[PDB]
């Protein structure tokens, strides 16, 4: 047969890597966005 060489950096070493970095960075961004929001309440609980 013939298979396209687009596989290149296949899973286990290359593309799986790139995936794991991007998932860690997005997870850290979301966790910082959702968890850190306690310190600022002095600036949002403003009634008037």
């Amino acid at each position: 047969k013939v298979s396209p060489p687009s596989l290149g950096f296949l899973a286990g070493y290359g593309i799986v890597g790139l995936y794991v970095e991007i998932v860690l960075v997005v997870g850290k961004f979301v966790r910082g966005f959702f968890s850190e929001i306690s310190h600022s309440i002095m600036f949002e609980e403003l009634p008037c």
Partner: protein, 48 residues
């Protein structure tokens, strides 16, 4: 931190008994506590 732990546990238990008419009051007390560092210092002294 015993007072605040008791407060949060009270929030959770008043939640688990489906009396929603105290959850707002308890949350208001907690948010006011975290709205002013002077009170949290006043609220976290050491027992004798």
């Amino acid at each position: 931190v015993d007072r605040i732990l008791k407060l949060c546990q009270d929030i959770f238990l008043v939640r688990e008994t489906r009396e929603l008419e105290l959850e707002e009051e308890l949350y208001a007390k907690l948010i006011f506590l975290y709205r002013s560092p002077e009170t949290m210092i006043k609220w976290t002294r050491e027992r004798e």
